Amino acid sequence: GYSDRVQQITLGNSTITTQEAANAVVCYAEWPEYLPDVDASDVNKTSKPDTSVCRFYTLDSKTWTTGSKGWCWKLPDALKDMGVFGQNMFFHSLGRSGYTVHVQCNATKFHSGCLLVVVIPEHQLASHEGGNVSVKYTFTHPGERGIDLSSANEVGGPVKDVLYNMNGTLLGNLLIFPHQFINLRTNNTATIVIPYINSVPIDSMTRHNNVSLMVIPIAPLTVPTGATPSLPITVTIAPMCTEFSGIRSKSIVPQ
């Protein structure tokens, strides 16, 4: 009586149940694991807070309306302030982590709409100015708020044009990245497990984000007659196999 459909994920002191899942994606078919010695470089023993950092943090909720263009969060940024995960983050020189991402959106059998939930490794954004204008730090570190693709261009911020993925590629091809759809008629959640993907064994958690999670409405939300025209979307994310190394004074970052 197991269905692909019902699932439970327990991680730390927190549990999620979905009764309307559509399997789960594990990026590149690899599950998060700690850093092996053969791959290690820094000689420091690392710190593995385990259950105090590897639990589920639910970010603040978004509201899908008929005019929504899509939202974008960066990792580990989105979690920069969650509990002890965040403290560890500002206090060590280097850290590394994988995540379980669970995006939630329920409706009824009269609604229609379909969101794309995708994880993009190394999502370098484009400046809407063109040329070689850079995208300032603050703009690519929105924190739990994430970036709202239907917000206005700002100065020093990225471009927010959806048919171009914020980088000069077409929305249609985002499907080459680990992703899952939430089609109100099928699905009510999306779950993706992200292994740590980098060109170095461990890195800085503040100067470099290693994935952007993106939720994009593709088939517009259509509510039943005289229904309220909107649904909330909630994102809950859990660091998994986290390791921190090179402890010290506590980083100070712009803004």
Partner 1 sequence: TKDEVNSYLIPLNANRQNEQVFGTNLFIGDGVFKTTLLGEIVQYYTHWSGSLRFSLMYT
Partner 2 sequence: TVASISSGPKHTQKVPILTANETGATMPVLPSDSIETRTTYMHFNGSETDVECFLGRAACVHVTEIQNKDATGIDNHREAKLFNDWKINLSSLVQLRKKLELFTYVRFDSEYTILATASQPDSANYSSNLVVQAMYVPPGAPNPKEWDDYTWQSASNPSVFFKVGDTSRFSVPYVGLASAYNCFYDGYSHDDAETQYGITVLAHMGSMAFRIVNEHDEHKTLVKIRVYHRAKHVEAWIPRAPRALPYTSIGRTNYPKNTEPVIKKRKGDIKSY
Partner 3 sequence: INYYKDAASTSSAGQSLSMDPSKFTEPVKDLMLKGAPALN
Q: Should residue 244 be labelled a site residue for a second copy when binding is judged by CB under 8 A?
A: yes
Q: Should residue 228 be labelled a site residue for partner 2 when binding is judged by CB under 8 A?
A: no
User: Which residues make Cβ contacts (< 8 Å) with residue 190, sequence separation at least 6?
Assistant: 22, 101, 102, 103, 115, 117, 180, 181, 182
Smallest distance, partner 2 to C-beta of residue 243, A: 10
Q: Quick one: what does residue 30 bind among a second copy, partner 1, partner 3, none, with the CB cut-off 5 to 8 Å set by partner type? A: partner 3
Q: Should residue 93 be labelled a site residue for a second copy when binding is judged by CB under 8 A?
A: no
Q: Which two tokens stand for residue 100?
A: 């379980």
Q: Which residues contact partner 1 (rule: CB under 8 A)?
A: 41, 43, 60-61, 63, 228, 232
Q: Should residue 25 be labelled a site residue for partner 3 when binding is judged by CB under 8 A?
A: yes
Q: Should residue 85 be labelled a site residue for a second copy when binding is judged by CB under 8 A?
A: no
In the region spanning residues 56 to 85, those forming contacts with partner 2, defined by CB under 8 A, are: 74
Measure Cα distances from 237 to 137, 213, 229 in Å. 23, 10, 27
> How many residues of this chain bind partner 2 (CB under 8 A)?
90
Measure Cα distances from 7 to 15, 24, 215 in Å. 10, 10, 21
In the region spanning residues 157 to 186, those forming contacts with partner 3, defined by CB under 8 A, are: 176, 178, 186
What CA–CA distance (Å, rounded) separates 253 from 255? 6
Cis peptide before 76 (omega within 30 of 0): yes
Rank residues 188 and 236 by Cβ distance to a second copy and give the closer one: 236
Q: Should residue 199 be labelled a site residue for partner 2 when binding is judged by CB under 8 A?
A: yes
> How many residues of this chain bind partner 3 (CB under 8 A)?
20
Q: Quick one: what does residue 60 bind among partner 3, partner 1, a second copy, none, with the CB cut-off 5 to 8 Å set by partner type? A: partner 1
Provide the sign of the torsion angle of the four alpha carbons 93, 98, 100, 103, taken in this order.
positive
Alpha-carbon torsion, ordered 231, 66, 149, 177, to 10 deg: 70
